[PDB]
C-alpha cells in the first residue's frame, strides 16, 4: 500500500523514468528505496527537493 515518507534523499533517471530515493518515516536507512515518481504523493517534498538542488 502506501507509507509515510520522511524525506527525498536523491533523484535519478532509470529506464526513462524519474526515480527518487526515499527515507521512510519510522524505518531504518537500510529500508531506503528508489521509487518511480508516480509512486509518490509528496508534492511538498518533491518541489522542495527540486528547488533546493
Amino acid at each position: 500500500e502506501e507509507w509515510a515518507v520522511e524525506k527525498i534523499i536523491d533523484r535519478r533517471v532509470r529506464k526513462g523514468m524519474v526515480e527518487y530515493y526515499l527515507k521512510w518515516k519510522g524505518y531504518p536507512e537500510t529500508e531506503n528505496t528508489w521509487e518511480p515518481e508516480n509512486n509518490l504523493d509528496c508534492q511538498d517534498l518533491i518541489q522542495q527537493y527540486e528547488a533546493s538542488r
Binding site: 507509507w3 526515499l22 528505496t33
Partner: peptide, 6 residues
C-alpha cells in the same frame, strides 16, 4: 506525504 513501494 506518502508513497507506494515498488
Amino acid at each position: 506525504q506518502t508513497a507506494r513501494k515498488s
